[model samples]
Target chain A: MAALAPLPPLPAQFKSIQHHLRTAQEHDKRDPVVAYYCRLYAMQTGMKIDSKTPECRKFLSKLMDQLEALKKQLGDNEAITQEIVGCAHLENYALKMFLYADNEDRAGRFHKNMIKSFYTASLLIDVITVFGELTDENVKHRKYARWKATYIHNCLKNGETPQ
Target chain B: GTPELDEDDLEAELDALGDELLADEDSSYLDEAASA
Candidate 1:
């Protein structure tokens, strides 16, 4: 397949969305709903740009459900914690991937890169949250982490930066 | 400060640790199984 083209700059509307999310993460110390919407928005944008398959759609739905649960667990005014911030960062990266996909020729390449990075990050986060400790017994978790790491490292070695 | 340790308390702590470890292992297994 031919190499994909590059994406255009993010739209002004998305910039506004980012600004709103940042503000909510910082001062809106009373509303996790904003952060929730930010994540949904980002995920939605990513789904739109990348895979429109049923599987991708299902993933988006599951992510939305997790966001909802997070909102309920956190409630409003719960000072934006590290977990929330990390989720927000993941959302931001997803959005950036979508932004990169705006270009038809580059969208495929950009989407591939994003999938690699997203899965790698997902594996790392899963290990941290699920295992919570680096013990020999957690061999399976370590294996998952290593698998993701190898893919990411190889991608980078091949001169791909996840766009 | 060292406090006298009861056998029951020691067992309880060990059980709790085991539970946590098992839960983590189970979750990882579930994820892999689901994906597969």
Candidate 2:
């Protein structure tokens, strides 16, 4: 399989942009289908933000271009009814990522991509919550992933580079 | 104590989960909207 394209650096002060793009990157290898939706969703989210800053607008267009490229490769729009099954599909994938990150943490595996997976799970969990009321279990995992992702993201931003 | 799952098996397992989730639904509804 081809290597995934490098993810765009996280935008400063744009939480949704960072979360969705990181999630798209994490799924790029295992499931391009998910990646496509994540990027598309990010595009919609970013448009709503519509920050006046040059950097924000620049990233928004760049993201749109990236989505266009992915769209061509995907060929056809996927058929998913936004019902319980739709929510479950995202939840199942997010749960897998949550467990993967948790397992890595327990094993002392601190490296690149691990934090991204946590970030992805957090993003997916956040999105799926709109589908219904989140259970306590969902909230717990989402918070854990969000905490881990933010902590590591800040660490890397300061060049600490957690190993 | 968890080992990383094999990539192929992991994808298959995810697919299986999706199939199970879809089992009770009229999957054709997914396509019907496309033609409209």
lDDT of 1 by residue, A1-163 (tens): 0111222333433432333233223212333434454555555555555555665556556656666666666665333355565545544443343333234225544333333333333333332332143345334433433343344344555787643
RMSD of 2: 14.6
DockQ of 1: 0.02
True contacts kept of each: 0.00, 0.00
Complex DockQ per candidate = 0.02, 0.02
Candidate 2 off by > 4 Å: A1-16, A77-86, A100-119, A127-137, A147-163, B1-36
Among these predicted structures, which one has the highest lDDT?
2
Candidate 2's iRMSD = 15.1
For each candidate in turn, the TM-score is: 0.23, 0.48
**Predicted candidate 2 versus true structure: per-residue lDDT over A1-163, tens digit per residue:** 3444565665655653564565456457656666666776777777777756888788877877777777676666442333455556777777776777778787877754565566546667766664556899888776566556655555665888554
Judge the docking of candidate 1 as incorrect, acceptable, medium or high.
incorrect
Residue A10, candidate 1: Cα error in Å is 24
Taking chain B only, the TM-score of every model is 0.48, 0.45
